[PDB]
Amino acid sequence: EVFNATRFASVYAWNRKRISNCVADYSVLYNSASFSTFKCYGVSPTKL
Amino acid sequence: NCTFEYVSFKNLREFVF
Ligand SMILES: *[C@@H]1O[C@H](CO)[C@@H](O[C@@H]2O[C@H](CO)[C@@H](O[C@@H]3O[C@H](CO)[C@@H](O)[C@H](O)[C@@H]3O)[C@H](O)[C@H]2NC(C)=O)[C@H](O)[C@H]1NC(C)=O
Secondary structure, three states: OOOOOOOOOOOOOOOOOOOOOOOOOHHHHHHOOOOOOOOOOOOOOOOO | OOOOOOOOOOOOOOOOO
16 A cells, blocks of 8 residues: 555655554565565565 | 554453563
């Protein structure tokens, strides 16, 4: 929902959405290749 | 401000919190 929302917020006010009590498919998100750049400074994609 | 939110005589209704 957040990534594929019809309107993506501008740089002026980057919207903050809080997700809780959810199963996080971080591996699936990494698997998605449409996003050009997936960079983790402080996390490990394998460990995510 | 809502870190967590969940939405969805004849009787006695007990409870323990
Ligand atoms: C949840 O609690 C209340 C809900 O009514 C709101 O608190 C406001 O949140 C801001 C930032 O989100 C906080 O700013 C604080 O202001 C002090 C004094 O100006 C400053 O030293 C800091 O910058 C501090 O973060 C503050 O708790 C409060 N705003 C004000 C003007 O008092 C808010 O909706 C929610 N967040 C927090 C943190 O309470």
